[PDB]
Symmetry: D2
Subunit: 227 residues, 4 copies
């Protein structure tokens, strides 16, 4: 047995919503780790020296075409980070059907579209990491977020069903659940950074996370502790 | 303080998906409890013993009309049981966008449409019980259910967000999460499939629709006022974990 | 199939720490439900006309004697409510071994002693309800409660291992996890404390014929305080 | 903002139960990461590659003496990995008070004794990692383990209470929960294999690293999916 950090394997990575914000920090961290990193965008293009593909995750045909472009460039996606997401907060009595479904379609169905398309090759190659970006809200229930909490909790159920089916083929699905990212409900008494989220994603994309499936990694300063 | 079961209060109940199967058992239990029970149906009609309103939970306009019809008949809804649901199982690689979205739209968004419409009068009257029928799959992840597990876990997030907002106004949202429940569909699986499922159940038996209804009865009762955002698993221990 | 509440079965009940507080409300509720209710006490006696047995749950021999007295009076215990508990809070760097072990020994090991003794007959009769009284602190982690949170979370693990072994024989173990009960509001969505009778209502449900298919569950009675993961 | 892995900081590490098996893999991984690593043992000694201190975690005075010996060797403990543990399984009806209390005293109270002793200087320096090694059994309930599951779930409650109190001072407590691991030796495991001690060590490495500062009260399952549930 090797005592230290396992030898690095450069994986084909796709980060959806990887062109700015937390997604860009995730993409830059995975590239710095040594992975081949592609990001989706909706017109802004890709930053730094990352491979960009245009993709709206509400569009299944765009998702299919984006994955094909990534595969031609750098090989089939081995690590999917589904970071694309939106918030449309509202108290329950004021939340409209449109506002609920928009958040579901991007955050939950959009993550499904990417995971489903990624599985086409992951299962065949007997390796895959599907890493959903969830939220403390999924299990803690932020009060103006019936739609967002539903979508982000839904990622847990999806990750666990995917893992129960496919972990025997080397394909796992896990959730990183950030809290507030750049205080009374946060034990740490501070917000987190995008780089702290990216550090958990880096772990789940690494050779140190093969035996982790269906897990929620909370990056929230303890905010979401409970049951 | 009274020692025994609190005095019963007859609530206006609506059970979506209450016209057949497990939802019908839920509705019949709540009626036997003493509540005024209405059920939805999609055109096949109300059960002989229960007031029915035609309502497709994918149609926000139909949800609004149905709540108005219930209100006229028995007062505004105080206890909503969201049982309307469908399954479209598939291996992940085979699951189409349509199979995913149809399950989400009925099971998750349809439950939202009903909870949102119910909340109007619940907050104003400072009482409401929103009871989502989830599944062991939400937190345990039954294979071939990327859609169903996503929908049924989403009910937990929604229930907790609703509870954090509205519990102070006496409005709670909770989830009953059944495991394998004896139905016509389960008795039609091959015996190997039925036997294989028992291996994952510590109780080594399937549950009944009346056991699901017993948990719903509790959450609709005067014994559940201080329970909010909870998952009540009715699954013989199948879903134990984290 | 029966449409309404299942036919009632009058069970032999033992509530540990049943002479006051939450335990007394649990015992009185289960008696009103129609059960045959015994309580443990440490000298104060049982309330009402309930059957009392003297028992300190840190003493395995006393637990054995107490169950034998209940068995002789009303039949072997079918429903055990392990309510006896104590708290001894401290900041971590101030918490002593003594203060940690005292809380463990009563709240966790004491619950084990009662569950283990109850299992003598439950498995043979193919029925048992072991109901632990936990706390929101078990999974939420109230500060200054390294001992109490450890003990109350330990009840979850024990209930689940007991349930995985014995549910096939009709014996289940579950946890009722109260939040703040009148005998802080900033962390409670309901913006109120709970009552002992609300805890007892959850115990009544878990002792009833409506809860046979519930095993290893945590029923939170906390106004939403403990919501999380 | 730094794009890549944060600059490594060498921490003073103590791994209880680090002299053999899974704990030894944890200690060897943390040393390979660049940390200064000490392990406990109950008299058989540490392997020659690591500094060892004799310490029975059922003995509060021995825990105190062990921490002082580590302090004099490599500075006060900054990262505590509590791996010392035993199992004494039995059917519930057969399990004795002694068998229950022995597992609690080592696995739960012993972890407390070490976390309590570490806390003073961690709080003073405004940095601490307390990493309990739990088990899938804590939340999944392996049968015949009323004692082991109780102890390993108790670590979760303890980690959360410690985190709620001390996370604001830079001190966090988390749990790594292994499933079936090769060094300690299937339909319930989605991965359809046992894990390795080095896979557990990888999760501990993460929780000891500069990538885990904002994680407190978490359970990191290393179990092939075995424990998924609620
Ligand atoms: O997370 P955080 O960074 O904290 O929140 P942000 O709002 O800062 O980031 C949201 C991210 O998700 C992307 N996104 C949103 N909706 C879609 C969609 N339908 N298809 C593809 N990408 C989408 C955004 O791309 P965009 O730049 O196009 O908004 C952006 O990259
Ligand atoms: O077993 P089980 O899981 O209960 O499967 P079942 O067929 O037994 O029950 C499903 C229930 O959900 C209802 N339902 C499904 N989709 C909708 C919808 N869009 N709007 C309203 N009701 C709906 C069904 O009504 P119906 O079958 O009458 O459409 C039925 O009452
Ligand atoms: N807010 C709250 O009150 C909450 C309480 N709980 C739990 O509810 C349960 C009861 O709470 P509560 O009524 O408030 O506590 P109380 O102090 O009011 O009563 C505790 C009971 O336990 C008994 N007891 C304590 N130690 C022992 C022992 N070694 N052997 C036998 N009996 C013992 C006491 O008997 P005696 O009269 O002889 O002392 C008393 O009957 C406890 O488990 C507590 O942890 C959980 C969540 C919240
Ligand atoms: O078999 P395992 O492979 O599971 O190893 C158990 C580990 O825990 C340690 N351990 C168990 N009980 C104690 C204790 N009371 N104090 C310190 N270390 C302990 C053992 O040390 P050891 O082998 O020294 O007892 C060993 O390192």
């Amino acid at each position: 047995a090797t005592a230290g950090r396992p030898a690095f394997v450069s994986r084909s990575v796709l980060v959806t919503g990887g062109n700015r914000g937390i997604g860009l920090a995730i993409a830059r961290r995975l590239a710095a780790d040594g992975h081949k990193v592609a990001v989706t965008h909706r017109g802004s293009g890709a930053p730094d020296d990352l491979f960009g593909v245009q993709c709206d995750v509400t569009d299944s045909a765009a998702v299919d075409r984006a994955f094909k472009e990534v595969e031609e460039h750098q090989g089939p996606v081995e690590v999917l980070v589904a970071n694309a997401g939106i918030s449309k907060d509202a108290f329950l009595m004021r939340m409209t059907e449109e506002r609920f479904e928009e958040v579901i379609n991007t955050n939950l169905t959009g993550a499904f579209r990417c995971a489903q398309r990624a599985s086409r090759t992951m299962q065949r190659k007997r390796f895959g990491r599907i890493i959903f970006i969830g939220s403390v809200s999924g299990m803690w229930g932020i009060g103006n977020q019936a739609n967002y909490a539903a979508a982000k909790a839904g990622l847990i159920g999806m990750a666990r069903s995917i893992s129960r089916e496919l972990a025997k083929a080397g394909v796992t699905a896990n959730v990183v659940a950030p809290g507030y990212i750049d205080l009374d409900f946060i034990p740490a008494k501070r917000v987190g950074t995008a780089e702290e989220v990216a550090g958990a994603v880096s772990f789940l994309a690494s050779e140190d996370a093969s035996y982790i499936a269906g897990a929620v990694i909370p990056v929230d300063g303890g905010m979401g502790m409970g049951h």
